[PDB]
Ligand binder design. Structure first.
Ligand SMILES: Nc1ncnc2c1ncn2[C@@H]1O[C@H](COP(=O)(O)OP(=O)(O)O)[C@@H](O)[C@H]1O
Ligand SMILES: Nc1ncnc2c1ncn2[C@@H]1O[C@H](COP(=O)(O)OP(=O)(O)O)[C@@H](O)[C@H]1O
Ligand SMILES: Nc1ncnc2c1ncn2[C@@H]1O[C@H](COP(=O)(O)OP(=O)(O)O)[C@@H](O)[C@H]1O
Ligand SMILES: [Mg+2]
Ligand SMILES: [Mg+2]
Ligand SMILES: [Mg+2]
Lengths: 307, 61, 523, 529, 530
């Protein structure tokens, strides 16, 4: 069994991650300290692919936590199961980075990737045989967009022969959640299509609806974790470009809806060039947006090929 | 409804190259008539755009 | 409740709507009124991303502020339009539109119809265009000194005025290098092929335009050379890795040797790609996609330096600069696609980062302007000013006609319009003469921002412009005195001033046509 | 106001308000950072929201760690960040000179003088001051003694005196080791590793490399004397085929054959390594160390241990170059045709365990063009402080080498430039003489703060120093132990010409732009939501 | 006029919940007060008469101990200066293993006296100068205060007498038994080479009986059962596999592709015949015990039972590695029979029941090996954890003695001699440094003062007696805890001794921590997250 390293970026990512690392820890008996307060041996059967046992029988998780703003990782330390993590796997900057994709993907938080990469190496070295990585982030939003794609990128350059299984919080259709979300999400999809091997699209809108059905902000990070374990607790991606998924209970072409929406709001804003000065004045060329758009019409047509 | 299932590794290379040579041949057939302007409702990969560039044609996707 | 329209649909109408639109417009104008001329002052804007924008540029300011009145929205949009079209005059246009709407408010209060005012405005616009074209002068664009003076006359009103000679030379070199012709179509694309890279630190006086391009990149492998004195360069859109096929190419192994044979086939594929590349005997290979470590091995064995993941725009600029042609299949590589023309590839450490220079090119049709300075904000402002300068140089190289600045053109046109109005006997003579006197706002604003006596100076200037050969007389924005522009040297591009006048008059026409606001209704 | 009629929830600072706001924030930053300046400065403690402790005297670190939300403070922090990224030192002095320029300009603007005229005087004085700096710079053959004095002038300000006397020799030797004649200094070739076990004065220079990892096979030796180093970038773990493959068998025997066969590809690379090892080490006299940038699975680790090879996995992309420069081999991305010329030599290789971490030392290289600084210390915050200090010192020595000139310190150049500016002032036309005077009184903030921090009267000390410099013309500064004037070039207090020039340039520029700010305005969305 | 506004500048630019302290009053004195409170929280645990504390952490876990570093770890210290003193104490624990409470006491004393000196009018710079020169003098002096040395670490009576002192502060009532146990273990695992590894002393805490039933075991104990039917073995030939005890499978997805009824009928029989062959090769190598780090398959277990092999499953990889070190084996990643060198040996391997707990014991008969285990019996998990901490103290003392064999007298004797000599040095040193030197000297008095206070006697009378005897010349005299009244006796002749390295590092680290706390002048706390 090969080991899987788990990076989590941005507020959304850092708050899905902790909940996942808690669900599974309780699925394995590990307490907040790390001691295996468990009886069954199936919990230890496949525990090496997630936890990196140390001397003293303390199972440290193979998890990195990243965000340009420290205040989320502080809330993760202080939260529950916030002490199993390695006190050095917390990599944070000082700049908030707003919600600009260019800010997170460029010199405005670019050196940090060189601090998360010497933690990816220090976490892969422990792994006997590294299966790959699992990055949890948000498609568009805060740093998760920019920093979540400069990470997929630099980790596909540094380890270009490993499974990169992303969990991204695709933006909900009703809630804009941000004025530059169409841009961030087309710019991030434009990187994930190339530098990723399998992407699970976790829609906040659908997750919120499922939570309401169960009832008949935390509740969403508690309704995404049981799906993240039903995906990572045990024949897909026929074509190496249609690797986007919608979990449930699905490699559906309903993704095409989300993509049509994102590309039509992208095109609406791009026509008037609204909120473009920030990207150009901080390190993008006005042609990266045309490329992103082209590549999203590409995706939408590849997905329209079936029906 | 078509799958590639290889049981002799020596065919993989030719199959992979054919996947691109098909489009290459279509583009060459189009350009052989004298077409210097090519309008398309669909997409055009970079591999194809390079053929148009070398031919001195104008392609639009 | 039995309504006909949904609640939240509020409908205003009439002179209240007209006066509201006009007040919103002239408020947008008053926001940036003081940012005009050489003696303007900076404004510190606070971005929603915790950023800061320290600028004098009307379009920068209006782009960073947010409004809810649709008239103010329209004014911001016309400022953006002016900036995108000519790249200068973004506050002159705003001020002119504000003044035109202000003077039209008068006639609107006095029972004149907005359509009458609008027709008068259009007559006046046509005559403004005629008068500008009459008072314009030509330019010998081969006179580098004349072009440098034009660029100084365009950047003197900005922060870089302290480094005027430097910025003028940078802009002129950049535009003259980006000037490109293919198939009988001249094209100055200073947005795709003139690149500004801001590296904080250093001093601005070492900023330069490179005879080549610059990217933030390092060699893929430290055994690769970092200095090449006549590099033959190859550009690729394809990954030199072994990637999967487009189909369901699933394999089925039953024999023992087959797994190893497949891995060795992958290695041999990479070898064959690298051999297809080496066959052209290049020195540098630059890719937009990845380069596998085995490919790096083979290239290094061939003594080739590789750069892994460059942007598509940077790759296009490298193509234009070094004379190469981007390829996507190394089997389809030809000597004509190889890049000869670069005189030096250097990879040097600026601060704690590695930057790749492809400079010393001969006939480079692309460039990188390397800006150095105190901080990201100072360098953003310098970059905006350089964008203004290059856009002015481009406008000149396109339309070599010049008109005098310092408000001299505004006063000349106002005088010509007042003289032409004496033949008008209908009721439109009054709004016509009103826009004529509304053009005086540019010299008025110049005098206000220099700190001189508007009444006295504008009177002396209107009097000077009543003489015969005095249409070149204007004002100093630095001393508050009248001068001849032939002696001062402030000459604007006819295209710039035409676009200014046209956009202003049409914005006034639009906002005058507008009445009866409606709101609330949801898409 | 105008903006508030269109965006009602808009914040605006106009003309005088704007200037008051900016100058107040600048003076606040100056008030905080005044105490950082000089070796007699005070160390500030900085506690994160999580509770992590930072002990620092560094202006840039202090800026970024302070809890501030002011636009002018952000501007000045950015100017300091650029200063630090390009020169490594001068951030505190940068902030101080900005604050004092703003104060001296407010002194005249409150009396109705225009900031434009003050900025004209600022630019004239900047020009003349740069000229005087070029005049006073001391072009010197950069010998170890000069570099030691420079690194001392930096490290004594950044850390304690005994630790500074240690870091001085460490840093100077490191740079003098990784430095090639007429070849820009790649500071990347100086690794900086921190160990958290011993005293802070144990910080040393290892003439080799220190990797933060060791061998992952227990039977592998922990010490190797005469070692052949193989720097490779070749995966020695199980690699799956790019195209989806899968195995199909009809019997457990066939399954066993396929299990043995699926590893043949990596076994072949292991065999190549083992054959090279046997060919170069015909006996157990010498040693053989494989250092892989990529992974090594347990089967390969066992196969190499059986042959007596020490294999390290997942090294750093920088350690590839550092190893090829220290040991002297060739870093490989393939074992196609590997030969003994691809190997480096290390006169000693061993392993050091510290709690849960392991370290690997590679020492006794012949003439390593890459070295490492081992930062030893009892606390994480001590280690961070020493890291910052050695960064400062490395940048200082590198700059003193690059610019063969070096400028006297202790405020001597500032005093002399103030005197020169005051003698040049009459040659300035109009009321820009007042801007020149303000520039001079701003330059005089370095000796003033040095005296204030050593515990002396600013005016009395500065009067003594200016008098001594006017009577003799010698470049004199503050003696931080007696408050008397002293010749910095004779007592060995040196500053970086590049740092002083960057100070002048960037401080003038940012102060000019701030003085020319006449409206601060927040009228955007105010959030990206 | 009813509100004081924040002053212009940093006070206004400061964030909402951030705090800024500056100067002797707001920063230095408050830090000294915090460190003093810390030293007071841990003072009553110092020495053999030190009392235990029951700290409950945020996870509702209970710690009953008088181990300073443990108490500090389990407390939620939130003041940064106290955090720094705790960092010093933990560095002392890491470097030496004993002396954390000394570090705390001494740092707190140095800081209290530094506050006193600042109040009388010295500057932090002068205080730090004097503290540093006095620490240097103390380091110069201590080697001369060294009284005895170990002279042999392969014996069991000498080693027990040497560890008794370190294991007296903890578990004062019963220390001869524990010193015997820890000496037996340390000298069993002490190799002919001078290197001693503390991880080779294993501690098994088993419920039931009490500390007098504890024992040493030359080998290993695992709270496991056997996977198969065999439970005892008398001439173990252990074979260790890091791989599961199952048929090897492909790392790439394997599929059993059947195309004929014959293949379908024969697949399972072929699989079983293969497993039988594998395990029979292992058994025919002579191995009677197999230890797998992975899982066990039903068929493999069947055939191991058939061929009379004891199967053991060690979930942990550290457990597997330590068993390999114990028995002299090599973990094989394949299920191939081991060669004569890859195999391990034990004089016995058996399943036993210590109390309610079932355990598998790999027991050597020889009085040596690479690993030894101490089986701790006890009536309470907290009691057994405290005894494990005492064992850790004894083992780290043994390692310190392997590093440096020098010993100084305990019970405050070295502290009093240091105080005396540094006072005599400061009386000669002129300048304002003498005040700080004399306070650094007086700080040492805090150690015998804390010992006396916990012993239950008048610390002032004790310290006066000690000063008198050390003035008349006896440097090995310290206080007698076995006395209802203030008393003193020869620490050397009594056998109460400390480690030169322990004292050296404790003094160094305490001085460095105090000096850093003093060097702090401004504090800029951020808004506490949460
Ligand atoms: N030194 C000067 N003296 C007087 N007028 C000037 C001077 N420099 C520029 N101008 C005039 O100021 C007007 C606007 O300058 P500028 O601020 O660059 O444009 P905008 O106001 O559109 O930003 C130009 O029409 C030009 O004629
Ligand atoms: N031993 C010394 N005696 C007198 N002046 C010194 C001494 N060491 C440094 N200085 C001066 O103190 C000033 C500030 O030093 P430092 O704090 O290292 O730079 P910065 O303030 O930019 O961080 C320097 O300009 C230097 O000239
Ligand atoms: N029998 C004894 N009589 C007097 N003092 C003793 C005796 N045993 C130990 N001590 C003293 O107790 C101190 C150890 O206390 P302890 O709680 O171990 O502190 P630390 O763990 O920080 O060393 C030593 O300084 C030693 O001198
Ligand atoms: Mg302009
Ligand atoms: Mg400094
Ligand atoms: Mg003790």
């Amino acid at each position: 069994m090969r080991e899987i390293v788990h990076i989590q970026a941005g507020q959304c990512g850092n708050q899905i991650g902790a909940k996942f690392w808690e669900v599974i820890s309780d699925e394995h008996g590990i307490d907040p300290t790390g001691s295996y307060h468990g009886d069954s041996d199936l919990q230890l059967e496949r525990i090496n692919v997630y936890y990196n046992e140390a001397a003293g029988n303390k199972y440290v998780p193979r998890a990195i936590l990243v965000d340009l703003e420290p205040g989320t990782m502080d809330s993760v330390r202080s939260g529950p199961f916030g002490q199993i993590f390695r006190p050095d796997n917390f990599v944070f900057g000082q700049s908030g980075a707003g919600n600009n994709w260019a800010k997170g993907h460029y010199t405005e938080g670019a050196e940090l990737v060189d601090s998360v990469l010497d933690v990816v190496r220090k976490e892969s070295e422990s792994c006997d045989c590294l299966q790959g990585f699992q990055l949890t982030h948000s498609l568009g939003g805060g740093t998760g967009s920019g920093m979540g794609t400069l990470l997929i990128s630099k980790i596909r350059e540094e380890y270009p022969d490993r499974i990169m299984n992303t969990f991204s919080v695709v933006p909900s259709p009703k809630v804009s959640d941000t004025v530059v979300e169409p841009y961030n999400a087309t710019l991030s999809v434009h990187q994930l299509v190339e530098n990723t091997d399998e992407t699970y699209s976790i829609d906040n809108e659908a997750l919120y609806d499922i939570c309401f059905r169960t009832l008949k902000y935390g509740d969403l990070n508690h309704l995404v974790s049981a799906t993240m374990s039903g995906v990572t607790t045990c024949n897909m991606v026929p074509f190496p470009r249609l690797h986007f998924f919608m979990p449930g209970f699905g490699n559906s072409t309903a993704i095409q809806e989300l993509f049509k929406r994102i590309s039509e709001q992208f095109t609406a804003m791009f026509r008037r060039k609204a909120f473009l000065h920030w990207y150009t004045g901080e390190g993008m060329d006005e042609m990266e947006f045309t490329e992103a758009e082209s590549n999203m019409n590409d995706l939408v047509s590849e997905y329209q090929q079936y029906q | 409804g078509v799958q590639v299932v290889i049981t002799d590794p020596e065919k993989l290379d030719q199959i992979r190259q054919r996947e691109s040579d098909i489009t290459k041949e279509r583009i060459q057939k189009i350009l052989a008539t004298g077409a210097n302007v090519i309008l398309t409702t669909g997409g055009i990969d970079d591999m194809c755009l390079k053929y148009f560039v070398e031919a001195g044609a104008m392609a639009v996707r | 409740p039995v309504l006909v329209l949904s609640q939240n649909t509020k409908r205003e109408s009439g002179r209240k709507v007209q006066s509201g639109n006009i007040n919103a417009a002239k408020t947008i104008a008053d926001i940036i009124r003081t940012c005009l001329g050489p003696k303007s002052m900076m404004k510190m804007l606070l971005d929603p991303m915790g950023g800061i924008v320290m600028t004098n540029d009307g379009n920068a300011i209006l782009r960073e502020i947010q409004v809810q009145h649709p008239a103010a929205k329209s004014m911001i949009e016309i400022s953006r339009t002016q900036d995108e079209e000519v790249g200068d005059g973004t506050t002159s246009v705003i001020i002119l539109a504000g003044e035109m709407l202000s003077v039209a408010e008068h006639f609107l209060e006095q029972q004149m119809h907005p359509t009458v005012v609008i027709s008068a405005y259009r007559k006046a616009l046509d005559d403004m265009i005629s008068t500008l074209k009459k008072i314009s002068i030509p330019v010998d664009i081969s006179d580098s000194d004349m072009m440098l003076n034009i660029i100084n006359s365009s950047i003197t009103t900005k922060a870089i005025s302290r480094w005027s000679s430097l910025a003028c030379n940078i802009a002129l070199d950049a535009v003259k290098m980006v000037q490109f012709e293919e198939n009988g179509r001249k094209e100055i694309d200073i947005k795709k092929y003139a690149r500004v890279e801001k590296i904080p630190g250093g001093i601005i006086e070492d900023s330069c335009v490179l005879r080549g391009v610059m990217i933030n990149k390092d060699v893929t492998h430290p055994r690769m050379r970092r200095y090449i004195k006549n590099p033959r360069i190859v550009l690729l859109d394809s990954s030199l890795e072994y990637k999967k096929g487009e189909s369901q190419t699933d394999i089925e192994i039953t024999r023992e040797e087959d797994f190893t044979r497949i891995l060795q086939m992958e290695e041999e594929y990479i070898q064959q790609l690298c051999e297809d590349i080496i066959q052209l005997k290049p020195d540098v290979v630059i890719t937009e996609k990845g380069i596998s470590d085995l490919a790096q091995h083979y290239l290094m064995r061939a003594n080739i330096t590789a750069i892994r993941r460059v942007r598509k725009t940077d790759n296009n600029r490298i193509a234009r600069a070094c004379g190469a042609r981007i390829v996507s299949r190394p089997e389809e590589l030809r000597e004509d696609d190889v890049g000869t023309g670069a005189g030096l590839l250097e990879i040097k450490k600026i601060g704690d980062e590695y930057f790749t220079f492809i400079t010393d090119c001969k006939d480079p049709k692309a460039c990188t302007i390397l800006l150095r300075g105190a901080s990201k904000e100072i360098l953003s402002e310098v970059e905006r000013n350089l964008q203004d300068a290059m856009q002015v140089c481009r406008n000149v190289l396109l339309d070599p006609q010049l008109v005098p600045g310092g408000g001299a053109s505004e006063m000349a046109v106002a005088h010509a319009l007042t003289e032409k109005s004496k033949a008008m006997t209908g009721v439109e003579q009054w709004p016509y003469r009103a826009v004529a006197q509304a053009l005086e706002v540019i010299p008025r604003t110049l005098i206000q921002n220099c700190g001189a006596s508007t009444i006295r100076l504008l009177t002396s200037l209107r009097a000077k412009h009543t003489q015969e050969n005095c249409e070149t007389w204007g004002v100093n924005g630095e001393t508050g005195t009248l001068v001849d522009m032939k002696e001062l040297g402030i000459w604007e591009p006819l295209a710039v001033k035409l676009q200014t006048y046209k956009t202003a008059v049409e914005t006034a026409v639009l906002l005058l046509r507008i009445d009866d606001i409606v709101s609330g209704h949801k898409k | 106001a105008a903006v508030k009629t269109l965006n009602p929830k808009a914040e605006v600072a106009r003309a005088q308000a704007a200037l008051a706001v900016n100058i107040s924030a600048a003076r606040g930053l100056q008030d905080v950072l005044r105490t950082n300046l000089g070796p007699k400065g005070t160390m500030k403690m900085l506690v994160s929201g999580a509770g992590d402790i930072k002990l620092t005297k560094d202006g840039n670190v202090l800026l970024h760690e302070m809890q501030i939300q002011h636009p002018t403070a952000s501007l000045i922090a950015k100017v300091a960040t650029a200063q630090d990224d390009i020169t490594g030192d001068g951030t505190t002095s940068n902030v101080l000179i900005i604050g004092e320029l703003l104060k001296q300009a407010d002194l005249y603007i409150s009396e109705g003088l225009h900031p434009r005229i003050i900025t004209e005087g600022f630019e004239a004085a900047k020009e003349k001051a740069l000229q005087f700096l070029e005049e006073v710079k001391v072009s010197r053959e950069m010998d170890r003694e000069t570099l030691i004095d420079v690194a001392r002038t930096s490290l004594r300000t950044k850390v304690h005196a005994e630790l500074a006397d240690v870091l001085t020799e460490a840093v100077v030797d490191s740079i003098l080791a990784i430095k090639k004649q007429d070849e820009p200094i790649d500071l990347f070739m100086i690794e900086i590793m921190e160990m958290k076990h011993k005293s802070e004065t144990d910080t040393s220079l290892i003439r080799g490399l220190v990797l933060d990892h060791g061998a992952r096979h227990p039977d592998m030796k922990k010490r190797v004397e005469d070692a052949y180093i193989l720097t490779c970038n070749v995966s020695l773990e199980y690699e799956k085929t790019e195209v989806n493959s899968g195995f199909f068998y009809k019997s457990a025997e066939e399954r066993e054959k396929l299990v043995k066969a699926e590893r043949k590809f990596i076994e072949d690379r292991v065999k190549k390594i083992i054959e090279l090892k046997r060919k170069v080490c015909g006996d157990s006299d010498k040693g053989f160390v494989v250092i892989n940038q990529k992974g090594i699975d347990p089967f390969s680790l066992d196969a190499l241990s059986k042959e007596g090879i020490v294999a390290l996995r997942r090294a750093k992309r920088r350690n590839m170059e550092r190893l090829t420069l220290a040991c002297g081999g060739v870093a490989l991305n393939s074992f196609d045709d590997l030969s003994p010329d691809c190997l480096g030599h290390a006169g000693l290789v061993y392993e050091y365990t510290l709690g849960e971490e392991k370290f690997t030392f590679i020492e006794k290289c012949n003439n390593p063009r890459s070295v490492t600084l081992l930062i030893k210390g009892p606390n994480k915050h001590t280690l961070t402080q020493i890291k910052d200090a050695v960064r400062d010192g490395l940048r200082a020595v590198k700059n003193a080498i690059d610019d063969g000139c070096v400028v006297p310190g202790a405020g001597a150049v500032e005093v002399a430039m103030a005197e020169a500016l005051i003698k040049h002032k009459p040659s300035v036309k109009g009321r820009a003489q007042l801007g020149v005077q303000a520039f001079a009184d701003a330059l005089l903030i370095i000796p003033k703060v040095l005296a204030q921090n050593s515990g002396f009267d600013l005016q009395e000390t500065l009067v003594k120093i200016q008098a001594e410099h006017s009577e003799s013309g010698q470049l004199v500064g503050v003696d931080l132990n007696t408050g008397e004037p002293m010749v910095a070039a004779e007592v060995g207090v040196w500053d970086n010409y590049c740092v002083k020039k960057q100070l002048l340039h960037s401080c003038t520029v940012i102060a000019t732009n701030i003085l020319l700010v006449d409206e601060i305005m927040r009228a955007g969305m105010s959030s990206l939501k | 006029a009813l509100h004081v506004p924040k002053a212009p500048g940093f006070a206004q630019m400061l964030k909402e919940g951030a705090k800024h302290f500056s100067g002797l009053e707001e920063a230095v004195y408050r830090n000294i007060q915090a460190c003093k409170e810390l030293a007071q929280t841990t003072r009553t645990a110092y020495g053999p008469n030190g009392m235990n504390k029951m700290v409950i952490n945020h996870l509702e876990k209970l710690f009953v101990t008088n181990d300073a570093a443990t108490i500090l770890r389990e407390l939620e210290v939130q003041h940064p200066a106290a955090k720094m003193i705790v960092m010093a104490s933990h560095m002392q624990e890491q470097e030496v293993g004993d002396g954390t409470n000394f570090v705390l006491v001494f740092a707190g004393a140095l800081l209290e006296l530094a506050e006193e000196l600042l109040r009388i009018g010295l500057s932090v710079s002068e205080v730090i100068e004097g503290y540093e020169i006095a620490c240097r003098k103390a380091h110069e002096i201590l080697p001369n205060l060294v009284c005895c040395s170990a002279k042999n670490l392969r014996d069991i009576d000498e080693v027990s007498s040497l560890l008794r002192t370190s294991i007296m502060s903890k578990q004062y009532g019963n220390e001869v038994f524990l010193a015997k146990l820890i000496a037996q273990a340390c000298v069993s695992i002490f190799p002919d080479s001078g290197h001693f590894n503390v991880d080779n002393i294993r501690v098994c805490k088993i419920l039931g009986s009490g500390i007098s039933s504890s024992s040493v075991l030359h080998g290993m104990v695992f709270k496991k059962e056997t996977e198969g039917d065999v439970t005892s073995v008398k001439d173990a030939k252990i074979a260790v596999y890091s791989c599961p005890f199952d048929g090897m499978i492909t790392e790439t997805k394997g599929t059993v592709l059947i195309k004929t009824a014959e293949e379908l009928m024969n697949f399972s029989k072929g699989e079983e015949n293969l497993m039988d062959a594998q395990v029979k090769a292992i058994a025919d190598t002579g191995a009677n015990v197999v230890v797998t780090g992975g899982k066990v398959a039903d068929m493999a277990l069947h055939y191991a039972n058939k061929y009379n092999i004891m199967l053991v499953r060690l979930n942990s990889k550290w457990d597997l590695r330590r068993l390999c070190k114990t028995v002299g084996a090599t973990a094989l990643p394949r299920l191939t029979p081991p060669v004569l060198e890859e195999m391990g040996h034990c004089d016995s391997v058996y399943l036993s029941e210590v109390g309610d707990t079932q355990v598998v014991v790999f027991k050597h008969e020889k009085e040596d090996g690479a690993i030894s285990t101490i089986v701790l019996r006890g009536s309470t998990d907290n009691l057994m954890d405290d005894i494990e901490r005492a064992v850790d103290d004894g083992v780290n003392t043994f390692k310190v003695l392997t590093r440096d064999k020098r010993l100084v007298p305990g019970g405050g004797a070295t502290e009093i001699e240091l105080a005396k000599q540094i006072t005599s040095y400061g009386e000669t040193c002129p300048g304002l440094e003498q005040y700080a030197i004399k306070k650094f000297a007086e700080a040492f008095e805090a150690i015998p003062r804390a010992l006396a206070e916990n012993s239950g006697v008048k610390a002032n009378e004790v310290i006066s007696k000690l000063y008198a005897v050390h003035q008349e010349g006896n440097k090995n005299v310290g206080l007698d805890i076995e006395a209802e009244v203030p008393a003193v006796k020869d620490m050397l002749e009594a056998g109460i001794l400390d480690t030169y390295l322990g004292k050296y590092w404790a003094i160094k680290l305490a001085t460095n921590a105090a000096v850093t706390v003093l060097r702090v002048d401004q504090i800029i706390m951020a808004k506490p997250a949460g």
